[PDB]
Write a protein that binds this ligand. Structure first.
Ligand SMILES: NC[C@@H]1O[C@H](O[C@H]2[C@@H](O)[C@H](O[C@@H]3[C@@H](O)[C@H](N)C[C@H](N)[C@H]3O[C@H]3O[C@H](CO)[C@@H](O)[C@H](O)[C@H]3N)O[C@@H]2CO)[C@H](N)[C@@H](O)[C@@H]1O
Ligand SMILES: NC[C@@H]1O[C@H](O[C@H]2[C@@H](O)[C@H](O[C@@H]3[C@@H](O)[C@H](N)C[C@H](N)[C@H]3O[C@H]3O[C@H](CO)[C@@H](O)[C@H](O)[C@H]3N)O[C@@H]2CO)[C@H](N)[C@@H](O)[C@@H]1O
Ligand SMILES: NC[C@@H]1O[C@H](O[C@H]2[C@@H](O)[C@H](O[C@@H]3[C@@H](O)[C@H](N)C[C@H](N)[C@H]3O[C@H]3O[C@H](CO)[C@@H](O)[C@H](O)[C@H]3N)O[C@@H]2CO)[C@H](N)[C@@H](O)[C@@H]1O
Ligand SMILES: [Mg+2]
Ligand SMILES: [Mg+2]
Ligand SMILES: [Mg+2]
Ligand SMILES: [Mg+2]
Ligand SMILES: [Mg+2]
Ligand SMILES: [Mg+2]
Ligand SMILES: [Mg+2]
Ligand SMILES: [Mg+2]
Ligand SMILES: [Mg+2]
Ligand SMILES: [Mg+2]
Ligand SMILES: [Mg+2]
Ligand SMILES: [Mg+2]
Ligand SMILES: [Mg+2]
Ligand SMILES: [Mg+2]
Ligand SMILES: [Mg+2]
Ligand SMILES: [Mg+2]
Ligand SMILES: [Mg+2]
Ligand SMILES: [Mg+2]
Ligand SMILES: [Mg+2]
Ligand SMILES: [Mg+2]
Ligand SMILES: [Mg+2]
Ligand SMILES: [Mg+2]
Ligand SMILES: [Mg+2]
Ligand SMILES: [Mg+2]
Ligand SMILES: [Mg+2]
Ligand SMILES: [Mg+2]
Ligand SMILES: [Mg+2]
Ligand SMILES: [Mg+2]
Ligand SMILES: [Mg+2]
Ligand SMILES: [Mg+2]
Ligand SMILES: [Mg+2]
Ligand SMILES: [Mg+2]
Ligand SMILES: [Mg+2]
Ligand SMILES: [Mg+2]
Ligand SMILES: [Mg+2]
Ligand SMILES: [Mg+2]
Ligand SMILES: [Mg+2]
Ligand SMILES: [Mg+2]
Ligand SMILES: [Mg+2]
Ligand SMILES: [Mg+2]
Ligand SMILES: [Mg+2]
Ligand SMILES: [Mg+2]
Ligand SMILES: [Mg+2]
Ligand SMILES: [Mg+2]
Lengths: 208, 62, 83, 99, 99
RNA sequence: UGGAGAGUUUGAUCCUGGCUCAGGGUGAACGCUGGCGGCGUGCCUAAGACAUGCAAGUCGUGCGGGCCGCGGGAUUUUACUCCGUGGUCAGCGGCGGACGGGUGAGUAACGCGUGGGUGACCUACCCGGAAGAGGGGGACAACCCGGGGAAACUCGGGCUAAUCCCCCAUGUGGACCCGCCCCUUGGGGUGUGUCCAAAGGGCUUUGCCCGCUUCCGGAUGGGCCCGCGUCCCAUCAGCUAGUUGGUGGGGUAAUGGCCCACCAAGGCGACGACGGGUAGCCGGUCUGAGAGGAUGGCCGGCCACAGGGGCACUGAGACACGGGCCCCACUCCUACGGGAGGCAGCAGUUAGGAAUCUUCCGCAAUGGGCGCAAGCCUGACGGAGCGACGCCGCUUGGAGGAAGAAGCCCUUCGGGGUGUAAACUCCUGAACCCGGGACGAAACCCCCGACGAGGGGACUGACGGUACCGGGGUAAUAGCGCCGGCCAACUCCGUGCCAGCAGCCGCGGUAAUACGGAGGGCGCGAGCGUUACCCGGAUUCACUGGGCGUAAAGGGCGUGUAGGCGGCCUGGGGCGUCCCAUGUGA
């Protein structure tokens, strides 16, 4: 099963602020606004010039840890993107962003990918009316991602759909906020996302 | 064959599994005994790399 | 004696046959002579049976006994329906 | 098509049979260089008509003896005792490879 | 331990026996015919040949001799007879041979 | 849409060069650990030996009986005997047992692959087309009577039916010899002569249903032959006497030295014969930028085998896994004379081994055999069981939550770490409980129509009370490896060339990031490591793509055989080469 364990703790280590808690990893602390250095006894000591490997490792750990996905599943996605037509960097990100668990979070229904995961798992989500409890499910374009009518009354869905009052959603998505349902209009270009990650390093990491 | 580990329990009729893995400082020693199998008991008091040495999980803080 | 019969493809709890012409003597899932159609008994998809009837007609024309159920599928695709 | 080959009669010692040496050439599968290779065929000559030196065609045939599966289709041109020399020398070299 | 279609065994032995005899007849009569033709023989060489032809075509009706094993035997036989006859005089009682 | 390199020879350097590692793979095994599901997969060894059950039969619409019953008659004397009908048993006869299932022992071979050839052939069942079935006769089991053997079985005698066997006829046709045409390997046609057919059964009974005969055609499946391809050793160089060819026979469905008589003296070999080694081949699989290398396990295709060696019978088809004969070895029975057996079918047991499953459910589906049909058989098969053995999917929570509890660890004594991690607050609700509940199954069959087309009708589920849907509902598993460099991850203690680590370089001799433990960290996660094996890196057998002055490597030098290679101009052929179209590449 997916990671399960301390989080705004690679918010640390990986240098950059990763958004794995959503509400707090967002507000005087991803723990990161207090301690911007690696975890552990050595965290605050002159970091050593990183090896080409270290670098490429880190960048891929970053990207992976962001989406909360496991190495085996991440890897197969990468290999899938590699076979496919077109810039194999973006494509991967295309696929990574097509995971229902993510879309749901991109759509505001959840505040975290991790929390989005639980929503999808416990039946609270529905693709094209039919419901779907697989975090890995590939959302294709055209697909309507609703919330489960039965699940609507829940405090949690309410808050998140209410705090989406004002909010704006990525160019590849749309969102009827009242009907608690969004849409997947097309797959995101690299430019559509602002990820702290140079995928050129990731492709590179999977080359040896 | 080499008997790896902290210390052992092997005597003259012992019956053991061999695995291959030379020792290099000992000439003509091209195999290791596998600990935890047949009459080679696994290494007691081993907290770390326990699965080589073949010693089950200890149970005080676990 | 050559036969129009079904050959099992698909998978466990997922039957999908091939209407196929083959020698009687051949193992059920082995080399056949011609696939002349396919049939999905659980109609999971709108197109669950198809048969090249020109070809069926040909094989009957050369003396090929269908399975009873091979011919039910053939009947249905108007293999013997006439005039 | 019954296979038709062409080569050179290099023996008529047998009754109603000729031996025919037949060259075939082709790229080497790895090294690409075109290489020659050859093989003798025993061919049926019911009228002991063909003799040493003749270029004949040879045609795939219903069996006539053990290892006789070809008949002599036609003469292509006579003479070629040069090619027969080629074969005969290659043959006597063999005795100079023993112990 | 008692597989009841070792009935097939029983049958085989009876059919064997039946074929075995049919063939012995064909042999001894053919031999008889060719033998007669050695001494240039009127009716009787053919008369016998004629019987034997029947006995063959007959055997081929069933499993005995099926086919053209039949045709083969007739062929070998009424060739042999006609040849051995023309060593010596005319094909008298016209019997079984095309004029 | 495809190509990463590093460590290690020195005081240092460049080059050569080996070794080692990082990557992918697995029918695995071993260690530690282990929650769920779906789909796959599972004796690599002893082609060892096997208890027990099950695995090929079916047809009464081919035939005649026996045995156990019941009913009605000829009979009014109870003896004899006719008919009908219910079980049941085998026998005769047919069709099936040559497929389906198993295995890889042998095989380096037209075995296999691929493309051709058959004027050199066969093909039961099936489909099309043409024509027939008219007399007559016979036997053998069943059953009855006797004999031998301990049993396995077996000998003798007597009756009997058929779709069993035979004779005569009819000959649409076909076969053979001779001849003649056409055609060209034995392909068509034709003329005398000769020779060859058949079986009956059922009826809701004068007209249908199942069959039978001969012939031609199709379809399927096969046999034979040929070109090319198919591993290692030349420290195997010469091999051959059915050998090589011929004439004539035999044998086959058919070609052929396949076999035999006789004749000739031939055949093969460095382009590797002969010999030895090893191996089922292939479609594929793994690897690799590719070229290539390795491989042939699952699934499909072909071969070969059925305790070891031979052999033939029957048959369309076998030289026949669950048929027969003989020899050999092993096990069991034995009244010592004689017998019985063959899981490389499904399970299963035992032995070997590091290691590989249930003596399960079901014929409901698909397929197969026999049957007019109903059906019967089917360990083929469809399912379930067991093993993280593999692949994929999912869980062990989610959001808040301190300048930050305790414990444990560092510390320059100020402070730092584990760490939002926990505790705690809301929120969801794997497991588990309640309810509904499958698809897979429409045919065979019956009725209308005509037994055809078409229409109507009824039955049928092993998996399974499973999947899936609905209601309720508990915060509810984490491990393994690594942290000197290659390589991502550092400190305190312990230890003192010991105990130990170790893939290679090398660590350990009192301050060890290398040993053991702790804290902390890195990496993967129901797994993680180990060992073993293949490809990779290895351009380290170099075709792509290497080298030989001193690193390994120019033969001591010549002569010259086979072979390889070949100046300039013109013409012909078009074998290589290039192009188009087409068949094939399941
Ligand atoms: N009994 C265990 C072993 O069986 C072995 O023999 C085995 C083999 O002969 C054969 O097993 C085959 C195997 O050959 C071949 N590679 C195919 C498959 N792997 C196995 O399959 C066999 O066993 C599996 C279960 O293990 C069965 O499911 C399968 O149906 C059966 N054929 O059948 C036997 C097991 O069925 C050895 N005799 C011996 O080591 C020991 O008997
Ligand atoms: N028409 C040609 C074919 O000949 C083959 O047989 C030939 C080949 O098997 C063999 O010759 C080949 C040779 O051509 C090729 N250039 C070299 C190859 N090593 C040889 O192979 C030979 O040796 C190898 C290795 O020892 C073995 O497999 C076997 O004994 C033999 N095939 O000997 C025969 C003549 O070369 C096929 N088996 C057969 O299918 C077909 O007749
Ligand atoms: N090694 C030196 C000598 O090589 C000589 O022969 C070789 C040399 O004359 C010459 O090889 C040349 C080399 O001279 C010069 N240094 C340049 C060139 N790279 C080489 O060339 C060779 O190698 C390249 C690949 O590297 C190939 O592509 C090429 O076809 C091949 N000729 O061509 C021959 C190819 O090997 C002689 N064998 C002997 O004197 C000695 O071995
Ligand atoms: Mg820190
Ligand atoms: Mg029978
Ligand atoms: Mg040196
Ligand atoms: Mg040094
Ligand atoms: Mg090196
Ligand atoms: Mg399973
Ligand atoms: Mg009976
Ligand atoms: Mg088989
Ligand atoms: Mg099987
Ligand atoms: Mg050999
Ligand atoms: Mg044919
Ligand atoms: Mg009669
Ligand atoms: Mg008698
Ligand atoms: Mg008859
Ligand atoms: Mg006529
Ligand atoms: Mg007659
Ligand atoms: Mg002959
Ligand atoms: Mg072998
Ligand atoms: Mg390479
Ligand atoms: Mg191979
Ligand atoms: Mg045998
Ligand atoms: Mg026969
Ligand atoms: Mg055989
Ligand atoms: Mg058996
Ligand atoms: Mg054991
Ligand atoms: Mg069935
Ligand atoms: Mg059936
Ligand atoms: Mg939390
Ligand atoms: Mg609740
Ligand atoms: Mg490092
Ligand atoms: Mg260690
Ligand atoms: Mg110390
Ligand atoms: Mg270390
Ligand atoms: Mg340590
Ligand atoms: Mg998983
Ligand atoms: Mg290489
Ligand atoms: Mg080169
Ligand atoms: Mg070199
Ligand atoms: Mg030198
Ligand atoms: Mg010199
Ligand atoms: Mg010279
Ligand atoms: Mg020369
Ligand atoms: Mg030139
Ligand atoms: Mg050309």
């Amino acid at each position: 099963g997916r990671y399960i364990g301390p989080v705004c703790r690679l918010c640390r280590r990986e240098g950059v602020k990763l958004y794995l808690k959503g509400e707090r990893c967002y507000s005087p602390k991803c723990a990161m606004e207090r301690r911007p250095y690696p975890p552990g006894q050595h965290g605050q000591k002159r970091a050593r010039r990183p090896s080409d490997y270290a670098v490429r490792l880190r960048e891929k750990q970053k990207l992976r840890r962001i989406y909360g996905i496991s190495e085996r599943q991440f890897r197969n996605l990468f290999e899938e993107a590699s076979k496919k037509k077109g810039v194999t960097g973006s494509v991967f990100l295309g696929l990574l962003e097509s995971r229902l668990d993510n879309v749901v979070y991109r759509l505001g229904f959840a505040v975290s990918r991790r929390q989005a995961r639980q929503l999808v798992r416990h039946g609270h989500i529905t693709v094209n009316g039919r419901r779907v409890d697989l975090p890995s499910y590939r959302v294709r374009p055209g697909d309507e991602i609703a919330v489960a009518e039965k699940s609507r009354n829940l405090e949690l869905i309410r808050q998140n759909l209410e705090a989406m009052k004002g909010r704006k959603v990525g160019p590849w998505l749309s969102l009827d906020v009242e009907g608690m349902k969004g849409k997947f209009l097309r797959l995101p270009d690299r430019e559509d996302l602002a990820l702290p990650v140079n995928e050129q390093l990731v492709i590179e990491f999977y080359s040896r | 064959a080499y008997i790896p580990g902290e210390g052992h329990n092997l005597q003259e009729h012992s019956v053991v599994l061999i695995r291959g893995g030379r020792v290099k400082d000992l000439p003509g020693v091209r195999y290791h005994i596998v600990r935890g199998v047949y009459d080679a008991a696994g290494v007691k008091d081993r907290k770390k790399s326990r699965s080589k040495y073949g010693t089950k999980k200890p149970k005080e803080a676990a | 004696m050559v036969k129009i019969r079904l050959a099992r493809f698909g998978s466990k709890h997922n039957p999908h046959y091939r209407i196929v012409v083959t020698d009687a003597r051949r193992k059920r899932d082995g080399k056949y002579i011609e696939k002349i159609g396919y049939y999905d008994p659980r109609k999971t998809t709108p197109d669950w049976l198809k048969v090249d009837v020109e070809r069926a007609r040909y094989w009957l024309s050369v003396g090929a006994q269908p399975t009873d159920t091979a011919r039910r599928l053939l009947r249905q695709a108007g293999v013997f329906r006439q005039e | 098509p019954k296979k038709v080959l062409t080569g050179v009669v290099v023996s008529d010692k047998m009754q109603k049979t000729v031996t025919v040496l037949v060259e075939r050439q082709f790229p080497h599968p790895l090294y690409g260089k075109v290489i020659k290779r050859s093989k003798k065929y025993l061919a049926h000559d019911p009228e002991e008509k063909y003799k040493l030196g003749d270029v004949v065609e040879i045609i795939e045939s219903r069996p006539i003896s053990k290892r006789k599966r070809f008949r002599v289709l036609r003469l292509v041109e006579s003479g070629r005792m040069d090619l027969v020399e080629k074969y005969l020398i290659r043959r006597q070299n063999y005795e100079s490879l023993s112990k | 331990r008692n597989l009841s279609a070792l009935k097939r065994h029983r049958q085989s032995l009876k059919r064997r026996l039946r074929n075995k005899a049919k063939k012995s007849a064909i042999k001894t009569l053919s031999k008889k015919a060719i033998q007669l033709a050695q001494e240039g023989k009127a009716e009787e060489a053919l008369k016998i040949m004629r019987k034997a032809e029947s006995l063959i075509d007959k055997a081929a009706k069933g499993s005995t001799l099926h086919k053209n094993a039949a045709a083969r035997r007739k062929s070998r036989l009424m060739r042999k007879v006609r040849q051995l006859l023309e060593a010596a005089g005319a094909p008298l009682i016209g019997g079984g041979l095309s004029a």
